[PDB]
Automatic annotation (TrEMBL), chain A:
It comes from Dabie bandavirus. This is Envelopment polyprotein. Disulfide bonds join 7-30, 124-137, 161-308, 187-197, 239-286, 247-284, 255-261, 268-273. Belongs to the phlebovirus envelope glycoprotein family. It is found in: Host Golgi apparatus membrane; Host endoplasmic reticulum membrane; Virion membrane.
Length: 321, 212, 218
């Protein structure tokens, strides 16, 4: 169920091979399958040569916590996944970004977590990995190939990312106001003031449901309903050559607009498709990605389509009583 | 807060030589140190970011290396253009802190100052002033002594000196000494002399003129 | 495209305050922290503080927490620094810069203002006198320009409206009393000068003083 979306895991041979910018959605998803995006992130920010996700690709990334509802649906996008597709940004952790306790950081080369106001990734440079606490990168000869298995990657959180329906600032302000109401004893989350409490604890691990609705910070939630709507939009399909892999942006724009390519049931239903007498000797075939759909959060008497919906560990300070 | 201890404070090297600047962070700053080159009159120009990445448009010779607390910046072959102050910057945790820079200076073959002296202008004598300007141009090294003689008698009061920065092109220094007498004081002497004590000639380079 | 345009040179009496401004353009103003760095003549830079243009939230170098107030106007892409209680130790060049990772472009960026110069002094702004230096001959010839008794910095000396730029030595303005004196020499071929007019052009904006002096021969 949690296999690849489109591409079996990579077997890179050169850690110095360039990572190409691909325009095609099915191209980019294939990179996401091969954890080429995380490898890209690492090369960009962390003095990293090579790749993570060797052999195992995205389906084998480590998660915290390890029971992880959303990883079972390969087509559910983690923060790094959305970042590759331009939907959010996983920023490079700096000194003011708290590493949540809990995860097995040891030996990890990349981990990321949603934070109260964004998404933060920690990297390690070539031939280094993380200490058990994750505070430091230290030598690790076990990573000298620069082709690292997927378990050197840690995605913190049961997190799902999707195209949002933007909400007016006043709505977010109301959600924000409900969130404060539901968590009166949380003062700061991930350094960001959440409630006003002159008097607060050291930052504590904080596991919480939350949605990113595209404003200054996420809105954390206790009692809330979620609903998964299968929307069958063209982002929910992937177009490939069953062996030659994903199709060009032109090829995939054809299939999702002209209805002349091959496709599983849902794709022919919603975009049309031609079976038999393949006009092109090498035609493409689009299929639905394995995911429950788009999540609509009901919270504070409101319904939202958020950027991300997640349950994950953040750092919160507690009010002194 | 985080101290960036940048050594050496000064380099003297010849065009072609390798230069290595070291910066030790008083605590771990990941790879979040940037290396700036700053030439006089200019703002700092980023060379290296993230400890070890050349900023875009940076020549191959500029490289940086480091993680944690030990950062090294290297010009694998210094070119005369690379006259500047270099400094690391930690941008890991606020307040971002700078290394005390490194003045890179080019060791270079010696050169006598071409000296030339300049009596007051008709315009300055009209206003009661009398500046006697002396340019000592394109010498090396920077060490140079200038003495003002009024009719053979040395003089110190009213002697203003400026030094250019080392030249980006020929790696030489250049100096301008001005001697502002009053007009009255100026009209009642004849020989005004600029005296250049420099490493090149054995006898002080001297140029002068005569007119009250 | 990308430009941090800083406000112009400033001269304030001690104890006064001064507002320096930085207009950002060519990039999404709110996506990037603005930093202010102070640099005194011949010293290294001092990081003053960062302001989050989304928030007006600021982190300061503690040495400046009371000297500077940082604000940002999203509506005009302007970061301001209000430097109060000015003494002479506040005279310096102040840079605004944004640097960091551009997550949109997916490249590091490092953008600096042109610098804004602050002189903390009660000395009166003073137009300079500008004096030709004819060499009263040999293979080359060196001319000169004396720009004398102006306050404050800066002064821009160009030779031949800037068309004469090689062989030029403009010397650091020297402060003495509370007037600056600046010197510039220019070396040209001997056949060039007496026949082709050389003129130092000197601008002292504080006094709105622009003057050209042709170095007529002796
Ligand atoms: C790591 O840094 C890489 C270098 O910037 C970056 O690749 C660059 O990504 C951008 C946008 O994702 C691409 O920008 C342009 O791409 C084409 C032009 O060929 C246009 O169609 C786009 O609209 C856009 O203007 C760059 O092409 C691309 N550069 C290279 C050399 O690949 C990676 O995305 C970065 N990775 C991470 C994880 O941040
Ligand atoms: C490693 O991958 C790279 C890129 O695919 C190749 O190595 C070099 O890459 C540079 C640019 O990055 C280009 O000059 C050439 O593509 C390669 N030149 C050399 C001298 O190798 C190559 O595919 C791999 N390198 C190996 C196998 O040594």
């Amino acid at each position: 169920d949690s296999g690849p979306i489109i591409c079996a895991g990579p077997i890179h041979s050169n850690k110095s091979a360039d990572i190409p910018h691909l325009l095609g959605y099915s191209e980019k998803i294939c990179q996401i399958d091969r954890l080429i995006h995380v490898s890209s992130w690492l090369r960009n920010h962390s003095q990293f040569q090579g790749y993570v996700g060797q052999r195992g690709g995205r389906s084998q990334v480590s998660y915290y916590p390890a029971e992880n509802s959303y990883s079972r649906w390969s087509g559910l996008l983690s923060p790094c996944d959305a970042d590759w597709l331009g939907m959010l940004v996983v920023k490079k952790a700096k000194g003011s970004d708290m590493i949540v306790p809990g995860p097995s950081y040891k030996g990890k080369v990349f981990f990321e977590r949603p934070t109260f106001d964004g998404y933060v990734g920690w990297g390690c440079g070539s031939g280094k990995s993380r200490t058990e606490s994750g505070e430091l990168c230290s030598s690790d000869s076990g990573t000298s190939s620069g082709l690292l298995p997927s378990n050197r990657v840690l995605w913190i959180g049961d997190v799902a990312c999707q195209p949002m329906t933007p909400i007016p600032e006043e709505t977010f302000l109301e959600l924000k106001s409900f969130s404060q109401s539901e968590f009166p004893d949380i003062c700061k989350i991930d350094g960001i003031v959440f409630n006003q409490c002159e008097g607060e604890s050291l930052p504590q691990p904080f596991d919480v449901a939350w949605m990113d609705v595209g404003h200054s910070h996420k809105i954390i939630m206790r009692e809330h309903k979620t609903k998964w709507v299968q929307e069958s939009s063209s982002k929910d399909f992937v177009c490939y050559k069953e062996g030659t892999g994903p199709c060009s942006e032109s090829e995939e724009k054809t299939c999702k607009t002209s209805g002349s390519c091959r496709g599983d049931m849902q794709f022919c239903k919603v975009a049309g498709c031609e079976h038999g007498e393949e006009a092109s000797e090498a035609k493409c075939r689009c299929s639905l990605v394995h995911k429950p759909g788009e999540v609509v959060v009901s919270y504070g008497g409101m319904r939202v389509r958020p950027k991300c919906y997640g349950f994950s560990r953040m750092m919160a300070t507690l009010e002194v009583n | 807060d985080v101290v960036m201890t940048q050594t050496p404070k000064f380099l003297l090297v010849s065009a072609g030589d390798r230069v290595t600047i070291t910066c030790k962070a008083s605590q771990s700053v990941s790879n979040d140190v940037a290396w700036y080159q700053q030439k006089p009159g200019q703002s700092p120009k980023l060379l290296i970011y993230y400890a070890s990445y050349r900023y875009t448009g940076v020549p191959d010779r500029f490289t940086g290396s480091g993680y944690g607390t030990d950062f090294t910046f290297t010009i694998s072959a210094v070119q005369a253009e690379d006259l500047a102050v270099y400094f690391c910057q930690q941008n890991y945790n606020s307040p971002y802190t700078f290394g005390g820079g490194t003045k890179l200076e080019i060791k270079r073959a010696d050169a006598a100052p071409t000296v030339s002296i300049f009596p007051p202008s008709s315009e300055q004598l009209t206003s009661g002033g009398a500046s006697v300007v002396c340019f000592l141009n394109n010498f090396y090294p920077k060490d140079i002594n200038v003495k003002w003689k009024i009719d053979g008698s040395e003089r110190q009061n009213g002697v203003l000196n400026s030094w250019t920065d080392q030249d980006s092109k020929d790696s030489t220094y250049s100096m301008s000494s001005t001697l502002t007498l009053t007009k009255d004081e100026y009209e009642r002497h004849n020989s005004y002399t600029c005296e250049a004590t420099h490493k090149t000639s054995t006898s002080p380079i001297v140029k002068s003129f005569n007119r009250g | 495209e990308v430009q941090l345009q800083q406000s112009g040179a400033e001269l304030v009496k001690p104890g006064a305050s001064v507002k320096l401004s930085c207009k950002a353009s060519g990039y999404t103003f709110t996506s990037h922290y603005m930093y202010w760095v102070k640099q005194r003549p011949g010293q290294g830079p001092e990081w003053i503080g960062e302001i989050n243009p989304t928030n007006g939230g600021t982190k300061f170098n503690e040495k400046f927490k009371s000297k500077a107030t940082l604000t940002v106007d999203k509506s005009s892409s302007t970061a301001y620094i209000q430097l109060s209680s000015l003494t002479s130790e506040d005279s310096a060049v102040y840079y605004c810069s944004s640097s960091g990772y551009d997550y949109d472009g997916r490249a590091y960026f490092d953008y600096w203002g042109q610098g804004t110069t602050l002189t903390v002094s009660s000395a009166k702004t003073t137009p300079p006198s500008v004096y030709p230096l004819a060499p009263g001959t040999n293979s080359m010839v060196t001319l000169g320009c004396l720009v004398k008794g102006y306050f404050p910095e800066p002064v821009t000396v160009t030779w031949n409206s800037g068309s004469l730029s090689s062989g030029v030595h403009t010397f650091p303005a020297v402060l003495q009393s509370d007037l600056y004196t600046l010197s510039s020499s220019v070396t040209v071929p001997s056949s060039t000068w007496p026949s082709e007019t050389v003129t130092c052009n000197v601008a002292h904006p504080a006094s709105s003083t622009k003057v050209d002096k042709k170095i007529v021969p002796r």
